[PDB]
């Protein structure tokens, strides 16, 4: 069901390009938005981590900025690596460094949502965004 | 590491305590893999639905950019190499 | 000018002159200047590449 | 071979002298590469065309 993942991946690449066309590129493709109450919010963060692999989450979070998670089918790659689009050409092996970096962005706090890209053979390519949960 | 597999082993194993209450073909659905499959399904369906309208919008923004290319510069194409070549030809004639 | 059908020579020559001049303006702009601008770049690129 | 090295070397220097003098009478010993020739003729053509 190879034909199946692919359509989605091409579409996510397209979502990224509409996002990147310009200032007036109001236009875009949808994606999953995740919302959860505080007990529910904690559950949700745990769930997002559990869905693919463990990642820095929860603890003390301003939750001020959304996180656009874009996933890629990772056949032919044997190492769980996640990278940041803005800091291009930078790959992170251990998610502890991802924890320190993105939590430093959490303490920094525009309202712009950081984009993320993570490649793992276990993970099916997706396009979820996690905004702060209700308190 | 390999937390993924582990969270998968527990999900496989836990429903065993009460398999009939929530297990295959039971009305309810649970565990991470079926959820993921459904997420894939819905994402594909909804994205596919918005595809035509988003496509039309892209064509609209392309048309407006093109019209501005008509009003400004009369739609004559230009590359950096064309600009440099023309200016170099001018300078060589002037210098001679 | 009122005897246009009586003087086909003069009329046909006038139409020829007019069509020639208005066609000539657009011809000069669209084609001639395009030649003056593209020709040096094309010569240099093609000669160096050759 | 070592013995003839002196006389042969002198003869080569002689023919080099003659070739050099002809370079003096013809072309006034000014240097020339093919690229210098091509660009000079191209600039001539460009001024002519403009």
Indicate the length of chain A as a whole number: 135
What resolution in Å is listed for this PDB structure? 14.7
Question: Do residues A69 and A116 touch, judged by C-beta distance below 8 A?
Answer: yes
Q: Say if residues B5 and A53 touch (Cβ distance below 8 Å).
A: no
Q: Which residue of B lies nearest to A120 if distances are taken between CA atoms?
A: B4
Instruction: Reduce the DSSP state of residue A125 to 3 states and report it.
Output: coil
Asked if residue A21 lies in contact with residue A101, where contact means CB atoms within 8 angstroms, the answer is: no
Q: Quickly count: other Cβ atoms within 10 Å of residue A83's Cβ.
A: 15
d(CA B84, CA D31) in angstroms, rounded, equals 30
* B73: region left, alpha or beta (phi > 0 left; psi from -120 to 50 alpha): left
From the list A57, A70, A3, the residue with the least C-alpha distance to A31 is A70
DSSP string, chain A: -HHHHHHHHHHHHHHHHHHHS-TT-------EEE---HHHHHHHHHHHHHHSS--S--SS----S-EEEEEEE-TT--S-EEE-SSSTT-EESSHHHHHHHHHHHHHH---PPEEEEEEETTSPP-EEEEPPPP-
Joined together, the tokens standing for residue B68 give: 């501005």
- Determine the Cα–Cα distance for residues D44 and D50; give it in Å rounded to an integer: 10
Rounded (10°) angle between helices B32-71 and A2-20: 40
With CB atoms and an 8 Å threshold, state whether D49 touches C39. Answer: yes
Could you list the beta-strand ranges (E) of A56-134: 67-73, 81-83, 91-92, 114-120, 127-130
Cβ-based neighbour number of residue B17 at 10 Å: 7
Distance CA B42, CA B45 (A): 5
Q: What is the dihedral of CA B44, B46, B50, B51, to 10 degrees?
A: 10
CB contact under 8 A, B93 and D44: no
Q: What is the dihedral of CA D24, D30, D36, D37, to 10 degrees?
A: -40
Tokens of D43: 């600039």
Task: Enter the tokens of residue B28.
Answer: 């309810």
Q: For chain D, how are helix, strand and coil distributed in percent, rounded to 5? A: 80, 0, 20
Which chain B residues are within 8 Å of C30, Cβ to Cβ? none
Number of neighbours of residue B24 by Cβ within 10 angstroms? 9
CA A65, distance to chain mean position in Å, is 12
A38 Cα distance to chain centroid: 20
Q: Which residue has the tokens 């002298």?
A: D17
Q: A115: closest CA among A20, A6, A10?
A: A20
- Which residue in C47, C34, C41 sits closest to B80, CA to CA? C41
Tokens of D13: 């220097």
Chain B and chain C touch, per 3+ beta carbon pairs within 8 A: yes
Q: Which of A122, A58, A37, A56 is nearest to A95 (CA)?
A: A56
Tell me the β-bridge partners of A128.
A32, A69
Number of Cβ within a 10 Å radius of residue B48: 12
Report the SS3 class of residue A30: coil
- C-alpha distances in Å from residue A19, one per residue of A13, A27, A116, D39: 10, 8, 14, 49
Sequence-distant (≥ 6) Cβ neighbours of residue B31 within 8 angstroms:
B11, B12, B15
A42-46: long-range contacts, CB 8 A cutoff, minimum separation 24: A44/A130, A44/A133, A45/A130, A45/A133
* Contact present, A23 and A65 (Cβ < 8 Å): no
C-alpha B4/C-alpha A135 separation (Å) is 29
Q: How far does the CA of residue C37 sit from the closest CA of chain B (Å)? A: 6
Distance CA C46, CA B17 (A): 80
Strand order in the sheet with A32-34: A32-34, A127-130, A67-73, A114-120, A81-83, A91-92
CB contact under 8 A, C37 and B85: no
């Amino acid at each position: 069901d190879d034909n199946m993942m692919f359509i989605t991946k091409k579409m996510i690449e397209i979502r990224n390009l509409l996002q990147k066309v310009g200032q007036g590129s109001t236009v875009t493709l949808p994606s999953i938005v995740v919302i959860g109450s505080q007990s529910s919010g904690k559950s949700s963060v745990l769930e997002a981590i559990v869905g693919h692999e463990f990642l820095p989450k929860g603890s003390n979070m301003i939750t001020r900025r959304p996180i656009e998670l874009t996933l890629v089918n990772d056949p032919e790659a044997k190492v769980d690596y996640g990278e940041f689009p803005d800091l291009g050409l930078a790959r992170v092996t251990d998610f502890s460094l991802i924890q320190k970096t993105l939590t430093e962005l959490n303490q920094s706090v525009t309202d712009d949502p950081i984009r993320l890209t993570i490649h793992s053979p276990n993970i099916p390519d997706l396009s979820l965004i996690d905004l702060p949960g209700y308190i | 590491g390999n937390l993924l597999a582990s969270i998968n082993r527990n999900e496989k194993n836990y429903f065993g305590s009460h398999p009939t209450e929530f297990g295959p073909d039971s009305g309810v659905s649970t565990g991470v893999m079926t959820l993921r499959k459904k997420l894939l399904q819905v994402l594909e369906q909804q994205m596919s639905s918005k595809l035509n309208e988003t496509t039309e919008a892209i064509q609209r923004e392309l048309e407006e950019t093109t019209y501005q290319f008509k009003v400004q510069y009369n739609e004559q194409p230009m590359s950096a190499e064309s600009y440099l070549a023309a200016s170099l030809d001018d300078f060589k004639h002037q210098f001679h | 000018l009122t005897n246009k059908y009586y003087c086909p020579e003069v009329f046909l020559d006038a139409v020829a002159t007019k069509l020639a001049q208005t066609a000539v303006l657009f011809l000069n702009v669209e084609m001639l200047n395009d030649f003056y601008v593209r020709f040096p770049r094309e010569v240099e690129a093609k000669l160096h590449e050759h």
